[PDB]
């Protein structure tokens, strides 16, 4: 499947092709990344809501299947295809 998101121009939004709820629970399979242009990408949010420890509380992500957003940067699925999304 293909993953698309908003252009380089706060609240970002990433949208996948088909649904992303693969679990019997209500858990999505999206991850958010950021990188300084001279460093490796850093995991920000996994399960689309968990806010991995070690990140400031300002990064709050939310969203159901096919409609995800990040409030105040790559969007990546990690279940089947492991494809990223080009964006600022």
């Amino acid at each position: 499947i293909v993953m698309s998101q908003s252009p380089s121009s706060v609240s970002m939004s990433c949208k996948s092709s088909q649904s992303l709820l693969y679990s019997s629970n209500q858990k999505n399979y999206l991850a958010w990344f950021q990188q300084k242009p001279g460093q490796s990408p850093k995991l920000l949010i996994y399960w689309a809501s968990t806010r991995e420890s070690g990140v400031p509380d300002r990064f709050t992500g939310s969203g159901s299947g096919t409609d995800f957003t990040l409030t105040i940067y790559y969007c990546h699925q990690y279940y089947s295809y492991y494809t990223f999304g080009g964006g600022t």
């Binding site: 399979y29 991850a31 490796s40 990408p41 850093k42 995991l43 996994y46 990546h76 990690y78 279940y79």
Partner: peptide, 18 residues
Amino acid sequence: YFCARAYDYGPFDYWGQG
């Protein structure tokens, strides 16, 4: 080229340098 590790269906936790 980046090197990362993750569980079978989990997120990419740690990324190696290029």
